Each structure stands twice: as C-alpha cells, then as structure tokens.
Design an enzyme around this catalytic site. Sequence first.
Site, mmCIF file in Angstrom:
data_model
loop_
_atom_site.group_PDB
_atom_site.id
_atom_site.type_symbol
_atom_site.label_atom_id
_atom_site.label_comp_id
_atom_site.label_asym_id
_atom_site.label_seq_id
_atom_site.Cartn_x
_atom_site.Cartn_y
_atom_site.Cartn_z
ATOM 1 N N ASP A 118 61.155 49.321 -17.388
ATOM 2 C CA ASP A 118 60.690 47.716 -17.525
ATOM 3 C C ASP A 118 60.002 47.256 -16.433
ATOM 4 O O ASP A 118 58.928 46.321 -16.759
ATOM 5 C CB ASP A 118 61.937 47.063 -17.987
ATOM 6 C CG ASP A 118 62.854 47.504 -19.103
ATOM 7 O OD1 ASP A 118 62.165 48.420 -20.066
ATOM 8 O OD2 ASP A 118 63.962 47.317 -19.300
ATOM 9 N N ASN A 140 65.542 42.275 -15.788
ATOM 10 C CA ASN A 140 65.601 43.718 -15.341
ATOM 11 C C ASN A 140 64.877 43.521 -14.137
ATOM 12 O O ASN A 140 65.024 44.097 -13.031
ATOM 13 C CB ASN A 140 65.281 44.528 -16.272
ATOM 14 C CG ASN A 140 66.487 44.864 -17.298
ATOM 15 O OD1 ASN A 140 67.653 44.822 -17.251
ATOM 16 N ND2 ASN A 140 66.192 45.957 -18.264
ATOM 17 N N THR A 197 64.528 47.348 -26.023
ATOM 18 C CA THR A 197 63.618 46.359 -25.130
ATOM 19 C C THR A 197 62.022 46.723 -25.619
ATOM 20 O O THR A 197 61.680 47.935 -25.855
ATOM 21 C CB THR A 197 63.747 46.999 -23.759
ATOM 22 O OG1 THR A 197 65.187 46.703 -23.525
ATOM 23 C CG2 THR A 197 62.918 45.881 -22.859
ATOM 24 N N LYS A 255 63.862 39.401 -21.150
ATOM 25 C CA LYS A 255 64.770 40.589 -20.944
ATOM 26 C C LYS A 255 63.812 41.450 -19.717
ATOM 27 O O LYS A 255 64.134 41.935 -18.900
ATOM 28 C CB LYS A 255 64.398 41.463 -22.313
ATOM 29 C CG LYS A 255 64.805 42.887 -21.992
ATOM 30 C CD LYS A 255 66.258 43.042 -21.517
ATOM 31 C CE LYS A 255 66.853 44.490 -21.159
ATOM 32 N NZ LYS A 255 68.051 44.620 -20.529
ATOM 33 N N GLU A 271 75.104 50.501 -18.956
ATOM 34 C CA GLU A 271 75.684 51.535 -19.402
ATOM 35 C C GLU A 271 77.084 51.917 -18.510
ATOM 36 O O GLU A 271 77.403 51.488 -17.344
ATOM 37 C CB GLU A 271 74.838 52.823 -18.767
ATOM 38 C CG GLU A 271 73.604 52.697 -19.553
ATOM 39 C CD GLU A 271 72.891 54.049 -19.588
ATOM 40 O OE1 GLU A 271 71.529 54.141 -20.144
ATOM 41 O OE2 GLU A 271 73.478 55.067 -18.748
ATOM 42 N N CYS A 297 66.273 52.278 -18.093
ATOM 43 C CA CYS A 297 65.444 51.193 -18.175
ATOM 44 C C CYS A 297 64.922 50.448 -16.917
ATOM 45 O O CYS A 297 63.674 50.027 -17.085
ATOM 46 C CB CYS A 297 66.465 50.102 -18.888
ATOM 47 S SG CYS A 297 67.117 50.702 -20.542
HETATM 48 N N1 NAD Z 1 70.466 52.223 -21.819
HETATM 49 C C1 NAD Z 1 70.860 50.733 -21.628
HETATM 50 O O1 NAD Z 1 71.719 50.567 -20.694
HETATM 51 C C2 NAD Z 1 69.908 49.717 -22.429
HETATM 52 C C3 NAD Z 1 70.200 48.254 -22.140
HETATM 53 C C4 NAD Z 1 69.497 47.356 -22.803
HETATM 54 C C5 NAD Z 1 68.652 47.846 -23.579
HETATM 55 N N2 NAD Z 1 68.137 49.111 -23.562
HETATM 56 C C6 NAD Z 1 67.033 49.259 -24.552
HETATM 57 O O2 NAD Z 1 67.777 49.983 -25.986
HETATM 58 C C7 NAD Z 1 67.045 51.169 -26.158
HETATM 59 C C8 NAD Z 1 68.048 52.201 -26.312
HETATM 60 O O3 NAD Z 1 68.905 52.370 -25.524
HETATM 61 P P1 NAD Z 1 69.812 53.666 -25.422
HETATM 62 O O4 NAD Z 1 69.962 54.084 -24.303
HETATM 63 O O5 NAD Z 1 71.190 53.302 -25.982
HETATM 64 O O6 NAD Z 1 69.143 54.814 -26.407
HETATM 65 P P2 NAD Z 1 69.584 56.449 -26.304
HETATM 66 O O7 NAD Z 1 68.403 57.338 -25.918
HETATM 67 O O8 NAD Z 1 70.706 56.734 -25.497
HETATM 68 O O9 NAD Z 1 69.837 56.789 -28.050
HETATM 69 C C9 NAD Z 1 68.971 56.126 -28.842
HETATM 70 C C10 NAD Z 1 69.331 56.824 -30.407
HETATM 71 O O10 NAD Z 1 68.225 56.629 -31.210
HETATM 72 C C11 NAD Z 1 68.144 58.096 -31.839
HETATM 73 N N3 NAD Z 1 66.819 57.921 -32.868
HETATM 74 C C12 NAD Z 1 65.763 58.026 -32.241
HETATM 75 N N4 NAD Z 1 64.785 57.969 -32.856
HETATM 76 C C13 NAD Z 1 65.308 57.361 -34.164
HETATM 77 C C14 NAD Z 1 64.602 57.130 -35.423
HETATM 78 N N5 NAD Z 1 63.459 57.193 -35.598
HETATM 79 N N6 NAD Z 1 65.444 56.524 -36.317
HETATM 80 C C15 NAD Z 1 66.683 56.548 -36.164
HETATM 81 N N7 NAD Z 1 67.377 56.906 -34.910
HETATM 82 C C16 NAD Z 1 66.576 57.433 -34.018
HETATM 83 C C17 NAD Z 1 68.177 58.855 -31.088
HETATM 84 O O11 NAD Z 1 68.635 60.054 -31.900
HETATM 85 C C18 NAD Z 1 69.202 58.236 -29.988
HETATM 86 O O12 NAD Z 1 70.374 59.028 -30.217
HETATM 87 C C19 NAD Z 1 66.278 51.343 -24.790
HETATM 88 O O13 NAD Z 1 65.061 52.510 -24.993
HETATM 89 C C20 NAD Z 1 66.137 50.450 -24.322
HETATM 90 O O14 NAD Z 1 64.808 49.875 -25.283
HETATM 91 C C21 NAD Z 1 68.974 50.079 -23.072
HETATM 92 O O1 UPG Z 2 74.306 46.949 -5.647
HETATM 93 C C1 UPG Z 2 73.474 47.822 -6.421
HETATM 94 C C2 UPG Z 2 73.580 47.762 -7.941
HETATM 95 C C3 UPG Z 2 72.891 48.666 -8.709
HETATM 96 N N1 UPG Z 2 71.923 49.532 -8.025
HETATM 97 C C4 UPG Z 2 70.957 50.529 -8.910
HETATM 98 O O2 UPG Z 2 70.174 49.565 -9.578
HETATM 99 C C5 UPG Z 2 70.053 50.430 -10.874
HETATM 100 C C6 UPG Z 2 70.471 49.578 -12.113
HETATM 101 O O3 UPG Z 2 72.075 49.436 -12.111
HETATM 102 P P1 UPG Z 2 72.908 48.669 -13.126
HETATM 103 O O4 UPG Z 2 72.270 47.087 -13.346
HETATM 104 O O5 UPG Z 2 74.098 48.262 -12.353
HETATM 105 O O6 UPG Z 2 73.101 49.234 -14.447
HETATM 106 P P2 UPG Z 2 72.280 49.651 -15.838
HETATM 107 O O7 UPG Z 2 72.837 50.541 -16.779
HETATM 108 O O8 UPG Z 2 70.856 50.193 -15.332
HETATM 109 O O9 UPG Z 2 71.886 48.126 -16.366
HETATM 110 C C7 UPG Z 2 70.856 47.629 -16.145
HETATM 111 O O10 UPG Z 2 69.768 47.939 -17.247
HETATM 112 C C8 UPG Z 2 70.345 47.477 -18.338
HETATM 113 C C9 UPG Z 2 69.018 48.164 -19.364
HETATM 114 O O11 UPG Z 2 68.413 46.698 -19.931
HETATM 115 C C10 UPG Z 2 70.443 45.952 -18.421
HETATM 116 O O12 UPG Z 2 70.875 45.797 -19.915
HETATM 117 C C11 UPG Z 2 71.701 45.572 -17.644
HETATM 118 O O13 UPG Z 2 71.867 44.286 -17.891
HETATM 119 C C12 UPG Z 2 71.095 46.121 -16.136
HETATM 120 O O14 UPG Z 2 72.184 45.626 -15.402
HETATM 121 C C13 UPG Z 2 70.860 51.578 -10.827
HETATM 122 O O15 UPG Z 2 70.113 52.708 -10.276
HETATM 123 C C14 UPG Z 2 72.086 51.357 -9.535
HETATM 124 O O16 UPG Z 2 72.488 52.362 -8.981
HETATM 125 C C15 UPG Z 2 72.007 49.600 -6.440
HETATM 126 O O17 UPG Z 2 71.305 50.458 -6.035
HETATM 127 N N2 UPG Z 2 72.797 48.714 -5.828
#
Ligand code: NAD
Ligand code: UPG
Lengths: 387, 390
Positions: free
Chosen positions: A255, A199, A116, A195, A143, A251
């Site tokens: 975000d 969120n 993001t 995005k 996640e 996130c």
């Molecule tokens: N966590 C989510 O559910 C989610 C959902 C949608 C988008 N995103 C976005 O995706 C990004 C990554 O999410 P994440 O939770 O999977 O990341 P993360 O923190 O779990 O892991 C990211 C990986 O990138 C590695 N890394 C760091 N710097 C690097 C570099 N210069 N080169 C190569 N590798 C490197 C790190 O060692 C780490 O293993 C978020 O910061 C956010 O921007 C996250």
């Molecule tokens: O009924 C509910 C649903 C969620 N949450 C809380 O809101 C946060 C977000 O939860 P959730 O959206 O279910 O999971 P995430 O892993 O945080 O994923 C969100 O954040 C990601 C990072 O970008 C996006 O890609 C996803 O679409 C978006 O759902 C968490 O603290 C939840 O515990 C509540 O309190 N009550």
Amino acid sequence: MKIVIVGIGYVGLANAILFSKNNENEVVLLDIDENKIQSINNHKSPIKDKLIEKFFVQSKLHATSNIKEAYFNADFAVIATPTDYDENFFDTRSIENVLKDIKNINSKINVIIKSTVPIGYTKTIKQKFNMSNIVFSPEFLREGSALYDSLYPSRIIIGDKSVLGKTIGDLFLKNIEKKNVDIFYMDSDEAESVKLFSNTYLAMRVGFFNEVDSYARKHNLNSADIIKGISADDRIGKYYNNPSFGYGGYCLPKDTKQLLANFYNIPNSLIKAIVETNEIRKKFITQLILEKKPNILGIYRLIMKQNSDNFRNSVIIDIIKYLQEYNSNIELIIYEPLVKEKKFLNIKVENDFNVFGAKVDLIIANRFDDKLKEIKDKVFSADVFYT
Amino acid sequence: MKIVIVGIGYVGLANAILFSKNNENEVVLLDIDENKIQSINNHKSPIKDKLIEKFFVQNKLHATSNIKEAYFNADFAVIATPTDYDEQLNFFDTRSIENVLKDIKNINSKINVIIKSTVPIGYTKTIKQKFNMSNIVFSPEFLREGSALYDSLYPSRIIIGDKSVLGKTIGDLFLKNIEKKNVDIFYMDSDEAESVKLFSNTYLAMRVGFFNEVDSYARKHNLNSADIIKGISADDRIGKYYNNPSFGYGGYCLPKDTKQLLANFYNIPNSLIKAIVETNEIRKKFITQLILEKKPNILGIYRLIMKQNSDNFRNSVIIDIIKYLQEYNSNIELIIYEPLVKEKKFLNIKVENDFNVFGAKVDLIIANRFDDKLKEIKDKVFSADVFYTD
Ligand SMILES: NC(=O)c1ccc[n+]([C@@H]2O[C@H](COP(=O)([O-])OP(=O)(O)OC[C@H]3O[C@@H](n4cnc5c(N)ncnc54)[C@H](O)[C@@H]3O)[C@@H](O)[C@H]2O)c1
Ligand SMILES: O=c1ccn([C@@H]2O[C@H](COP(=O)(O)OP(=O)(O)O[C@H]3O[C@H](CO)[C@@H](O)[C@H](O)[C@H]3O)[C@@H](O)[C@H]2O)c(=O)[nH]1
Ligand SMILES: NC(=O)c1ccc[n+]([C@@H]2O[C@H](COP(=O)([O-])OP(=O)(O)OC[C@H]3O[C@@H](n4cnc5c(N)ncnc54)[C@H](O)[C@@H]3O)[C@@H](O)[C@H]2O)c1
Ligand SMILES: O=c1ccn([C@@H]2O[C@H](COP(=O)(O)OP(=O)(O)O[C@H]3O[C@H](CO)[C@@H](O)[C@H](O)[C@H]3O)[C@@H](O)[C@H]2O)c(=O)[nH]1
C-alpha cells in the site's frame, strides 16, 4: 438473509464469522482454492492462527467453489480477494473476476468491496461494469487479531453517501459488538484514500522509530530510553513504537508503494521516504549482522510478530535475501516450524530447536520470546519493549 | 533556594513563574534586554499567556542584567537563552549558552546549571568537558508557546539527562514546583535526553507534514480533506489531534530542530528526517501555486501569527508564503491585517489594521486558521484549516 464472502483469507474469514454468529444470517464462503473450501466444511480453520478460534470448535457456515450455489439468492456479496501491486501495476484482476461472475449470475446483489484498491478504483469499476450496487468499505483488521478487529472495529468507513451507503452501514452496525462506533460516510475516492493513507501512516511511524533505533545504534546510545522519552508525549503515544528489522507483512509494503505511484514527479515526499527508509533500515540491519562476522547464522522464525500465522512478505525473509546478496558464504539455517520442507529459498530448515541453537554462531530474531531466553546471549534483535 | 533563570523568553518566563509561586524560592530572571527586564520589574508580563497573566494578576520574581547580582549565592541556574539553526554554515547556534556558562564559570562555577534550551545531540557531554564543569544537566523543555506555563505546571513528562545524584536533585527540584500529580519522569544519559527532544519535535513536524500531504493530494484531485483526515484519525494508533492541515509547520522550534537532526543525519541517501524538512517546503510552494491560480489582483493576508493564541510570528509560515508570493508573482498587491504590527509597512507590504477597509480592499484573503472574525467574509477566504480549531 444470505451473505456471500468471496475469499477465505484473513479478511473474508473474519467477516464471514462476524455475519454468521447471529442465527438470522446465512453465510456462504466462496473461493477458488478447494483446499480452503475443504478445510472450512471440515470445521477446521485454514488460517492456522485465529485468536477467536473458539468459534469453530463451539453458528453454522458453508464454503463452496460453486459460483452458482454461492450467489444464488444472495442479498450481499463481500469481496475479500487478493489485490497486489507489481510494477506500476495495480493488480485488481481478482476483483474484476468476481464482479464479472456477479454481473452474470445476478447483478442486483449489493456488493461490498473490502479488498484494498487504488484511489478512484471503485468509481471507475462501477462505470466500466455498469453496476451501481457496489460500495467500497475498507478493512482495517490486523492479522492474528482479525476477528477481534472485526467485532471491535477502530471505525467503520462507508465509501457511499447514498441510501445504498446507509444500507451497507446498518448491516455492519447490527452485527459488530463494539458500540457507539465511529461510522463515517463519504464518497468512494475518499474512502480508498483513508485506507491507503492510514496504512501509510503506520508504516511511517514504524519507519520513524527504526530510524531512531538506527541512530542510537550508530552512536551507541540507549534506544529504549530515547523511545520511552519520545513516546511520553501524548501526541505521540506509548504504542506501535517497537523497533524491528523493518515493516513488512502482506499490505503495508504494497500500500505504501501504491500511494507512492500516485506521488511521482514531485522532488521528494514523506510518501517516498516512507518506502525508502525501510530498505535502508533492512540494509543497515544486514550490515550490523555482517560486522559480527558469523560463519553459520540461525534465522529464528520466518514470521515477524509472534501472534502470526504466516510469513508472506515477512521482513526477515528480506533480511535473508540481503544476507545472501552481500555474503553468500555465511551459511544460513532457518528455525520455522510452519515450514515442512527442509529447504526454504535454498536454505536448510532445522526444526529441532536444540540442534538449531547449538549449530549456529548467532541467532537473529525480529522479536524475543521466552523460548529464546535460555540462549539470549547469541541472539541479535532490535526488539526493545518485547511486544 | 535561589534560582537564576537566564533568558526572559517563553521558556524562561514560564520556568521563572513555576519556581517563584513557591514563596520559599528566591527567583531572579537575568537577561541582556533591558526592555524585558524593565517590564518584569514593573510586574508586567512581556508576553501573553493565560495562566502567566493570571499569576501576575494573583500576586515574587525580580529581574536584572547584572550577572554578579544574579549569580551571587545562586543554588541553581536555568539556561533558557536562544539556540538557533542558521542555514548559512548548516550549524546550530549555541553561543548564548556558552556566553552564559562563561559568566557562571567566572562568578560561581559551582552553581547547579540546568540547560533547558534545545541543543545538538552530544552538546552537553562536550560542553561539560570544554568548561571543566560536571555540575551541568540537560533537561529538555516541551512547552508550547501560549500554553507555556500550563505545560510547565502540567508537563507531559520530565526528562532528566543525568543518571547521577545531581540529576536526581534536578528531577526532584522539578517535582516539588510542578502541580502535575504523579508525572512520568525519565532519567537517562545526556545524549539520550538531547535525542528525545530533537526526535520528539521531529515526530510532530512529521505528523503535520503527513496531514498536509494528505490535504495536498486531496486538493490535487478535488476530494474532501475533512472526510479523509477524519477517517484516518479515527484509528486510535493515529489519533484525533495534531492533525489540522495548514500552510506548513512553523514557529521558533520545529523548523530549526528538524533541520538540526537532519544535519546530524550525516550522509543518508534518503530518510524520514530529510523528507520531513523537504515536504514542508513543497507544501509551501504548493500553497503559493494554489493562491496564484486564483489570480487575485489584491491579496489580503489575515494575521502574521501561526495561531490566534500566539502573539508572535517569528518563523511564521505566513511570512514564508508571503516571500514565495513576492518571488513567484511580484505583481499581486499584498495587504496585511496584523494588529500586532504598529508600523505602516511590514516587509514593504502595506499594513491595514482597520478590518473593515482590509476586507473591502482585497479580492481574496489567506488565513492559516479560520477565526470568529472571518466567518463574516468567509467567501473570499482561502485556508487549509479543516477543523477550525482556533
Ligand atoms: N492481510 C490483511 O491483514 C488485510 C487487511 C485489510 C485489507 N486487506 C486486503 O484484503 C485483501 C485480501 O486479504 P487476505 O490476506 O485476507 O487475502 P488472502 O491472500 O489471505 O486470501 C484471499 C482469498 O481469495 C481467494 N481468491 C483468489 N482469487 C479469487 C477469485 N477470483 N474468486 C474467489 N476467490 C478468490 C484466494 O484463493 C484466497 O483464498 C488484501 O489483498 C488486501 O487487498 C488485507
Ligand atoms: O511497534 C511496532 C508495530 C508494527 N511493526 C511492524 O509493522 C508491520 C505491520 O504490523 P501491524 O500493523 O501490527 O499488523 P498488520 O497485519 O500488518 O495490519 C496492518 O495492515 C493491515 C492491512 O491493511 C491493516 O488493516 C491494519 O490496520 C494494519 O495494522 C509489521 O511488519 C510489524 O512487525 C514494528 O516493526 N513495530
Ligand atoms: N519557544 C518554545 O516554544 C520552546 C520550547 C521548548 C524549548 N525551547 C528552546 O528554548 C529556547 C528559548 O526559547 P524562547 O522562546 O524562550 O526564546 P526567546 O528568544 O524568546 O528568549 C530569548 C531571551 O534570551 C535573552 N538572551 C539572549 N542572550 C542572552 C545572554 N547571553 N544572556 C542572558 N540572556 C540572553 C534574550 O535577550 C531574550 O530575551 C529555544 O531556542 C529553544 O531552543 C523553546
Ligand atoms: O494540527 C496541527 C498542529 C500544529 N501545526 C503547526 O505546527 C507548528 C508547531 O505547532 P505547535 O507544536 O502546536 O506549537 P509550538 O509552540 O511550536 O510547540 C512545539 O515546539 C516546542 C519545541 O521547542 C515544543 O516544546 C512543543 O512540544 C511543540 O509542540 C505550528 O506551525 C502549527 O501551526 C499544524 O499545522 N497542524
């Protein structure tokens, strides 16, 4: 055809799997964390909680820290590295580190940014690196349903309207399972907006239903009744409406503060309140715990939802800090099996559940589970639907 | 078997027809407005609604202003009188409900009263005590104007704010007369039921508030709003509905219900509730600034209604935009096309109901929603309508 996934977090690993489950594709995971690379090459998932973790036990896959090895002869690179917001600081240095490596080794790899980024970032970074082969396509996975969400995406957003855009688009359609997926093509600022605003909507909805719960608690009304009544309007819906200690995770808090940086110098806004209501809700939860006047308090799990690997920016850690600020005399005890050290944030960890439940006056848990039911009576939770 | 409906408005009329279709019910509408009573008695729907007109077409109900006649031998009274939030004194106005309960208490205090009008949280509990009547049940109304009777026959859910057998009687009375098959019905205490209504409307206002802030941001940066909103809404937790940007949310109810809940949110430094109200006013001033940046000399207002189906413009956001324009730049000549207005002026603004002259007179037309007629003139038309839902 060779695909490099940069970053073995939830986003990279789920995308790596999506592309590797078809024999035609060679998939390489690139990271700087040798713990992550060593895990992968031992056919262990470093992300301890994977729904479809059947993939590792039963399509080949290779991880490396070697910039040269990964990008050599690669058709696509997917950037899934961390992006944070720190204050107003838009932390994208990991992205620029990758793009700098990519521009050095070979520049014509078609780059897909999944991390993001701030609105307007991709257009800026193409100009500043002199690279047109960069396409932002946001990631919407949850996640702990990461790979499910990758195979069955809500929709595919391609932040590019040219032929490079359709190229990236067909790459995902030909590898996802979900069929007749919505796929939308748009310019890059619009995709980045989709995005951050998506969120921010979800944060807002959680903030809404927690304000309902706060109101019900202050007037000693039945929260479940009110929320059930609200949610039966189909325009509102029976989902994603379970009150909690507040929204958190990796996130949503970042975000929402991101977008709020864009929304300064206007008197108020939903975007500002979406951030501020969450802190008020956390302080109100804290005040409610204090009013019960416990002497020893057990924190049940540092995770938020029960299908979760991690507690990175878990709301219940914010609750701990608020408790420590408003009454450090309350002894806190954590039950969290994922923590191997016996002090987290200077708080004792007790991973014997029987000892933990007996030791404490009161247990706070974001969500109930069956393991809590035996001692339901000393448990404080805002969980309503037991999701 | 004899049901009195108090208030010949959108809610009253819809409920009155809901009950009189079933020829074993005797249904009387009761009002203070002899014009509306006259219309009803002449088998004339004083408002417009597709299914309501069809009912009047197909074939019943009777109306009056005599309370002794209406209430005599009535088994049920449904209160659909107006509740207003009045900015002066920051209070919700419930006099109409109290005037009606006083009539009921003196003529037949044992009528089973059903309050459909939206009320403050805690109202029904306090009003049962103040009048010494426990036969009062709050049951919120969720109908949309112009789909009032469809929403009456096919309601999203039934909320009965009483868990006693009286509430069970009220819920069962609605099950009988609705045509929606296997409908969600929730029994709950009265405060929870009042909470459901105010919060449900507040959510809807919040959603319109959200997608207008998206549209506002997109306009500030020359981005495609339709792209952004479609990508947002494709997330099934957000949804492809109730998401069309506009000049602001309006109508009878959303603006008053959000301000009421905000009042009941006593002394909170910030909140979604307070923001939901404040963002609507910011959006309206931003729309006005946008119009003025186009420096029109003669500005046409296309319709005072919120939406094509509506035939009223109480609290229409169009009128707020008019008032902001009159305040920010009184030099622009305003012209209104609104066939529902028969007089030569409205708010001292010339009304031009010949569409030909209206479109040629003005340099720029503002319309909350596009319709059929405007496509012919699309190039001088300013609107935030994204999906042309009309
Ligand atoms: N966590 C989510 O559910 C989610 C959902 C949608 C988008 N995103 C976005 O995706 C990004 C990554 O999410 P994440 O939770 O999977 O990341 P993360 O923190 O779990 O892991 C990211 C990986 O990138 C590695 N890394 C760091 N710097 C690097 C570099 N210069 N080169 C190569 N590798 C490197 C790190 O060692 C780490 O293993 C978020 O910061 C956010 O921007 C996250
Ligand atoms: O009924 C509910 C649903 C969620 N949450 C809380 O809101 C946060 C977000 O939860 P959730 O959206 O279910 O999971 P995430 O892993 O945080 O994923 C969100 O954040 C990601 C990072 O970008 C996006 O890609 C996803 O679409 C978006 O759902 C968490 O603290 C939840 O515990 C509540 O309190 N009550
Ligand atoms: N309009 C909606 O979309 C909607 C939807 C759900 C709930 N509600 C709630 O229902 C209430 C009424 O809505 P509406 O659109 O029908 O309003 P309305 O103004 O069109 O109806 C008011 C009618 O009640 C009459 N009346 C006023 N005082 C009276 C009295 N003392 N005795 C008998 N009749 C009296 C008035 O003469 C008028 O004809 C709203 O205030 C709102 O609280 C409205
Ligand atoms: O996508 C959208 C949908 C609505 N609006 C505006 O929001 C306001 C209310 O719209 P709507 O809800 O469709 O019509 P109402 O007749 O006002 O009905 C609302 O107000 C009643 C409360 O009394 C409730 O019963 C209904 O459930 C609730 O929909 C209006 O100004 C709309 O123009 C938008 O701007 N964009």
